[PDB]
Write a protein that binds this ligand. Structure first.
Ligand SMILES: [Cl-]
Ligand SMILES: [Cl-]
Ligand SMILES: [Cl-]
Ligand SMILES: [Cl-]
Ligand SMILES: [Fe+3]
Ligand SMILES: [Fe+3]
Ligand SMILES: [Fe+3]
Ligand SMILES: [Fe+3]
Ligand SMILES: [Zn+2]
Ligand SMILES: [Zn+2]
Ligand SMILES: [Zn+2]
Ligand SMILES: [Zn+2]
Lengths: 385, 385, 385, 385
């Protein structure tokens, strides 16, 4: 099966190292990006499906690196149905679970936290809600977990540790040994960073992070309560861990992180999540909002903001997507400046603070959205011929 | 019925003329604020309910000036139950309907748009969801409405015109005459400002706004697509209309509006809404987020950010609330810096970009929240004795 | 637009005077039943859509004469989303509102009850949820309504009065004049019959019904509390009003009503509703269950039970549907005995107490269901070729 | 902690061996029934909570032995929120999971079905929705499960096998060995008995049941499609397994089973469930309706129908509740004839076919309902003094 997207005004690659591709044509074959170039690719198109981008912008499908899933497409935290479908219409094609703290009666012992992670991992792989690639089993560390539990979880398809600090495992002395077992058996590890619900140890320090050694510093701008700029500095300077900016966090610290990362050349490490469902709410346009806020308020190139939502995120998680390059999964968005925006194109809209209009979303090359029900309308909508 | 709130660390009034009150005790009598002062008000307490603010902050209950209600506490736009109850836990005690475009099969003729406005106006006055004061009937202007229709609507308790532009009445030549009739019969009038679903008339200009003469320029920072800075300049400089900053809008333009309003002495005109339910999502902490955003990013005193969410808004709508002053309705929040925040108090938290922890919320003096289920935890929680 | 259903094993007409049609082919043209006959009707089919009934049974689409709607497809009484599309998968193609007592903060004055009925009438005609024909505006009688109000409502498309007794109008002395105005202006009238919430007047008598003169005696078997058999006798014998058996009512009295009506030649007056959403629940297979219950427990022929759910109901309401006859609206079900049933066909299943499997549902000739998501599976499924 | 219920007009025990207790006073101590008797028990009450039954009826809290839970209080099958809370208002204080077929993306391998059962078992014991005792982890048998899997599940608190036939284990030849392992390690076993979704083997026979050896013959009257009377007779006569009559099943077969069980002395084996959520709907008054239907249509004493909903069910599952006897868990309903009913008391109402009014529900002696939101109003309401 073959699909060609033609007449592309701008291709944003999602790769921070070279964020724009000098090409106007993308060929998709058997769910993968096959070729990127010019009109020469249209000869020998055969019976391909043709999508006319009508001069608009193609980006990778967005990742939300911080979703609190609990099974299927219902969110108990805010009593919301169909929230994953809604996020897809905001461009989100892959979701990473940050753990399931809202699972009703969440099992908090070692066997229970394990069984829940296994359940959610298998269930989301069995059924992609609205076609979204949900990596749904992110184990919450609890006292009593052994190395064999991590071996068992890996056997059953679990490969993510959810926010360290959500369970009974909180201080680095207890966390580090488990994080070590996790890493030894192929897990990616997240860590809650910011204000906590405990009057004793109310915040999370750089030393905590440094000693625990997560792959991802979760909500570095707070969830929603932020760590100090002093601790931000130490995390940025003393580690190479991913620095996750979340929509449901502190915008001042988000700006600080973005600006300092630009100063220090650390933008490749910045990844976007929602941290929702949460007390804040549920925001299907959350990742686009992150991109618009960072680009429009923190003086980051909109193409680089796209990388923060896409390739930066898949780089940390080791996924074969989030980047427009041959061999990568064909998860793609066709978007434009929205009607009435001062901006001439999608990247211009992002830089101006306007959420772009999404026309088409592909997952594995298949059209799963042909007009977003959530974004404002694209000025130039893609047409599937 | 009498309630006394004692041991208050800071009183934020909601009145931009004097944002802080140098007092530590508040007396509530028969649903109204009766006295503001020192410990002398504790004399002859009697059977009064005593609330210990534990050295934290008292503000007015927040207004959301831009809610798209549709009956009760269910939002079809994002398939969300109990969203008003949720907003209450983010401090929202009064909501203004911006109209009901999501009402299923929304009647779009003159008789139908009127009937729906009357229905929702009466229904929300009959049943306050979770105790929230919802002004739920905001008529959407459609072709065929007469002055008599406005007289009838006023008789039946309707006094708000929802975002002009949501219905078939769009251009100023059609809108102006109806807004005249509305204003003649005691209505407050809202107007959609920014990008629209119309390709031909893609944006709403300042000329449109100046000609139509609404009381409120709805989502001046876009819903979510913003007008140009040049059009913002003109609305700010050529009118005295309220300028509504919404959570589901352009953050760059929100910053521009706030900073320019500060330079031009127009901060009293700025009011906060969510513009939700919408494509963006549903954000019960949305008004708090507006406050933190404007305070931490636009260099606005957090006390004045409170005014934008409270007294500025009730001033525009002529409501006897949103201000801590004798004779005003006793809608009050007790809040603090959240656990782990670098800030020492609630106002400090807001200026730092951290959502404050809400402990207690009163509506008409009655405790409707005793611990927020949505905000981070307050460092010092108020206790009802 | 033309559709032909061929290879029909049994046609059940919905007309109690002739419950079975000796034919095996139905032609639908422009949303209406055009012809019923044999294979000759297949000649020169041309571009026609062909549906192979696979030797199974065709019946009219079912009516639910007692639905408590409140706008769109959400039911606040039991916090249920998409209940109307669910009922469609139980074969329900038309719904009659019995009033909207669950509308949150339901307006209870004359002007409010009017405004709500107009709103719901218009909204449901604007948007058929899942394609279902919902007659959604059934005014609840309240003190203060005048004849001019009924004139206004009729002008705006309202033609139903909901259960008399749901509002402040309760006793026959107050009700009779209003019902008189209703009937004068072309309204159909329902009346609550059974146990009430008032300790003083705890029940409804035949005298009440005789004096009030509704078209439909709502929930004659109770909603859920039944009137006595003595009162049932008088309603059956002293009036010609429709006798509505509801799913959410008393099964002993349902049986009594069915058996006595058979004895007295009054089966044409028996009509089926759910009386849901209600305290009992929400039962999308409710009308089918009524048919199965009456056929299997009350010794009523299954074909006559079909009439009670279809033609008996549309006759009372004067709707051009519910009967398989030329010129009637092409609302049709193709159904069969369910897998594993002792019965050999759909009617046999109903008589045996087994809910039939629904394969196809047409509304105005368009396929809105091609396999029921709610019924057990049909042994022989219809196929659209 | 002590509670006394006084002024009771009738006590229905839930014990089929002695269905009525000739007493008017019940003492509850530390969550258990302490004593049953007369006025003498009111002596030296002290600080005991006193509940005045107002001359109405006390029964045990009802069981629903066939609930398809899937985590928390949301039901995906019918998109219903808060269904367990709703069932509590229908008197349901204990639920038995029949398995979780509706879990989104339900894991179907051995490891996954195990993980899911462990998760649900633990989660429902951690958090009782609305106070309801949910036995939530009922494993669905899948090919690949071993005796060791059952040892592991038992260790983690799982003790129920959900309907045999929901998963890849369908043939009695495959099921019997697994059911043996379950019984060896303390499990109670359910078995789907009725029409299936496999055309090849479309039903379940008595021989299937005899070979499999479940504890409960699930939905003996169909789910919703019934087995034949021929198979019913043999199950009744050749096994001593529990015969579950479900609300979402065939009423003719329900009547056949109840009547034949009365003739054969087998009423102690009859237990009640809903089989919901299901295609039929969600019926919070479903257990009450079961009692009303069997008492009013099948000539079963209403006190015996209560046993079928209570003590019969807890006997099968080995639970220390369902019966008013000293030492049993204090799960109790106070109920009456509903307003307007021909019946003078609660049992009379059930026999008459009228759902009784529930005033108070206790779980572990704690008042979880003080007025049912779902049943009609009790004539005489209990009052906590
Ligand atoms: Cl969190
Ligand atoms: Cl809008
Ligand atoms: Cl009712
Ligand atoms: Cl089932
Ligand atoms: Fe966190
Ligand atoms: Fe707008
Ligand atoms: Fe009724
Ligand atoms: Fe079953
Ligand atoms: Zn989180
Ligand atoms: Zn709006
Ligand atoms: Zn009713
Ligand atoms: Zn079942």
């Amino acid at each position: 099966s073959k699909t060609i997207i033609k007449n592309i005004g701008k291709i944003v690659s999602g790769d921070i190292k070279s964020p724009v591709l000098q090409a106007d044509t993308i060929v998709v074959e058997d769910g993968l990006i096959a070729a990127i170039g010019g009109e020469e690719l249209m000869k020998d198109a055969g019976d391909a499906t043709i999508i006319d981008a009508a001069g608009s912008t193609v980006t990778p499908g967005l990742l939300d690196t911080h979703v609190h899933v609990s099974g299927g497409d219902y969110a108990p935290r805010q009593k919301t149905m169909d929230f994953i479908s809604s996020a897809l219409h905001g461009g989100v094609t892959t979701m990473i679970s940050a753990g399931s703290p809202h699972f009703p009666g969440r099992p908090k012992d070692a066997a229970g936290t394990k069984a829940l992670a296994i359940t959610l991992s298998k269930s989301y792989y069995n059924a992609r809600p609205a076609g979204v690639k949900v990596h749904g089993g992110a184990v919450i560390l609890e006292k009593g977990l052994t190395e064999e539990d991590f071996i068992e979880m890996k056997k059953e398809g679990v490969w993510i540790v959810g926010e360290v600090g959500l369970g009974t495992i909180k201080n680095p002395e207890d966390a580090a040994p488990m994080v070590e077992w996790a890493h030894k058996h192929g897990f990616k590890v997240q860590m809650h960073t910011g204000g906590t619900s405990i009057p004793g140890s109310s915040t999370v320090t750089a030393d905590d992070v440094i000693k625990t050694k997560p792959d991802v510093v979760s909500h570095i701008n707070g969830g929603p309560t932020a760590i100090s700029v002093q601790e931000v500095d130490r995390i940025m300077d003393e580690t190479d861990f991913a620095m996750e900016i979340v929509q449901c966090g502190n915008p001042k610290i988000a700006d600080y992180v973005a600006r300092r990362a630009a100063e220090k050349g650390q933008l490749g490490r910045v990844i976007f999540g929602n941290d929702a469902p949460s007390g804040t709410g549920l925001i299907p346009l959350g990742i686009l909002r992150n991109m618009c806020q960072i680009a429009s308020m923190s003086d980051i190139d909109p193409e680089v903001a796209v990388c923060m939502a896409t390739g930066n995120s898949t780089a940390v998680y080791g996924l074969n997507t989030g980047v427009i390059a041959p061999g990568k999964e064909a998860d793609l968005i066709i978007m434009d400046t929205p009607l009435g925006s001062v901006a001439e194109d999608a990247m211009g809209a992002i830089a101006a603070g306007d959420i772009p209009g999404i026309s088409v979303v592909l997952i594995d090359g298949e059209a799963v959205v042909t007009k977003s029900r959530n974004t404002p309308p694209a000025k130039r909508a893609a047409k599937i011929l």
